[PDB]
Amino acid sequence: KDKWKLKQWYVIYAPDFFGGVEVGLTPADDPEKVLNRVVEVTLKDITGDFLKGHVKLYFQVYDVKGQNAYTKFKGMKLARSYIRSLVRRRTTRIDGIFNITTKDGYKLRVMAMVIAARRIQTSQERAIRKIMQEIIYKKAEELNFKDFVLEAVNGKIAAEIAKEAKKIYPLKKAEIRKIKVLGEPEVA
Amino acid sequence: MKRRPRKWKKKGRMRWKWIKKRIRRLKRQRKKERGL
């Protein structure tokens, strides 16, 4: 059918900071329409080594220049079955939800999680949480936006919470889980 | 109603809840019904 057979195959790009690597094919007629659809892909597909298979990412387009939608970051999500495989009995998860902003002004909301080895009472728990918020605050003052999203999802901050939180009690699989954007700044 | 719990046993009788409700429909009466 023409309604079908009048479509037109635009292409998407990885956002610039990841290094442009093409992903996906999308059909559409007129360039005014496909400007607020979103994408999900893994990390493995964009220069990804397998063992980062359980990471999941999001871009939203922002422009249509002649069969090219250059994307823009939107968020990041982990695999629900994956974390489901961590929280078992006698484990006592630890939650942390935080608001930060960035040098260049992007303000974001992150939700990072730890898991101890045993059960522990709060007065040896909440300190962990305070420690996480601290060693993230300091972090998010020196970095641009694009670079911040780079290294957390690279898998880097984990190796630091899983360093200064051990100094209270031994633990396993410390890391950040989901990242959602809030707005975008006025400058530039 | 100053309960007496030997009656709920439902042995050779009827439920208690649904007897209370019916005694109300007569105390409300002999109070209202020209008991003035």
Binding site: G24, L25, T26 | -
Partner: protein
């Protein structure tokens, strides 16, 4: 490149089943098939048989327009109701690949609430 791809949402139930074959971003539908379209009886509206039939015919459409391989997204009504998938899952996905379209990442996206709203019934259940 030349890799045309797409996403198939598959929505199950106790009472019917639904297949939705879509573009990559998910906003542009391609082909839609149900259970109430092929078979008739309402005993077998949930059978695996209608599941297969409609779920082969779905591929038999979306295979011409250009879709090649597919990712899967399975889902139950969930939410404020039952959390169990219908038995039609392997009634579609076992047979879908058998229709020649490839397979990529496969996942269910069952919606669960953190203490959602009130279920039906109430203090005595579906008192059959």
């Amino acid at each position: 490149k030349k890799e045309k791809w797409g996403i198939a949402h598959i929505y199950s139930s106790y009472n019917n089943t639904i297949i939705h074959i879509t573009d990559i971003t998910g906003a542009e539908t391609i082909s839609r098939w149900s259970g109430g379209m092929v078979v008739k009886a309402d005993r077998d509206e949930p059978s695996p048989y209608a599941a297969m039939l409609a779920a082969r015919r779905a591929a038999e459409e979306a295979l011409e327009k250009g879709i090649v391989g597919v990712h899967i997204r399975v889902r139950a009504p969930g939410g404020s109701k039952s959390k169990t998938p219908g038995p039609g899952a392997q009634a579609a996905i076992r047979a879908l690949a058998r229709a020649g379209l490839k397979i990529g990442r496969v996942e269910d996206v069952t919606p669960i609430p953190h203490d959602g709203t009130r279920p039906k019934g109430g203090r005595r259940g579906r008192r059959v």
